[PDB]
């Protein structure tokens, strides 16, 4: 990518080869983290 | 495991901004990884 | 899915699943649903 | 209809799980759409 904010017209940062072993590992991890945080949010909803 | 919800969008699929909570290692200003997801294979990378 | 009771095992109903490809779009929809429901639950949290 | 964030972890494979996007008829004994996805293939389904 390139960060495209004003006065920022350069390549922002650099990275190594960004990959994981399992195609769905990051997707399923995201889904489970979303489940955890919605559980926390609903628990605090009921408490408050 | 410092993961924050700042989403990414594809270059091959600019229509869909793939809703991905980015995952990097620790204190991104001392090593920052933008996480990847093309819908077909989501990737968490590494940097130096 | 199964159903066992009273000293004998048995076979409950089942899903006649239908294969529809393009998991990318449906995964995007699912994760968007996750993020949106987390956000609404957090809004309820702060309002309460 | 209604999607539900529920991952019944499939013993046959971890990369695919039946997320809930139930489109329930007059009863859950009747057919409804369940979509399980992989990231490389997806599958809907109905119950007989």
Swiss-Prot record, chains B, D:
Q: Give its localization.
A: Nucleus; Chromosome
The organism's place on the tree of life at top rank: Eukaryota
- State which tissues express it: Widely expressed.
Q: How is it modified after translation?
A: Phosphorylations by PRKDC at the C-terminus of XRCC4 and NHEJ1/XLF are highly redundant and regulate ability of the XRCC4-NHEJ1/XLF subcomplex to bridge DNA. Phosphorylation by PRKDC does not prevent interaction with NHEJ1/XLF but disrupts ability to bridge DNA and promotes detachment from DNA.
Q: Give the UniProt family note.
A: Belongs to the XRCC4-XLF family. XRCC4 subfamily.
Q: Which disease is it linked to?
A: Short stature, microcephaly, and endocrine dysfunction: A disease characterized by short stature and microcephaly apparent at birth, progressive postnatal growth failure, and endocrine dysfunction. In affected adults endocrine features include hypergonadotropic hypogonadism, multinodular goiter, and diabetes mellitus. Variable features observed in some patients are progressive ataxia, and lymphopenia or borderline leukopenia.
**Record's protein name:** DNA repair protein XRCC4
Which species is this record about? Answer: Homo sapiens
Source species taxonomy = Eukaryota, Metazoa, Chordata, Craniata, Vertebrata
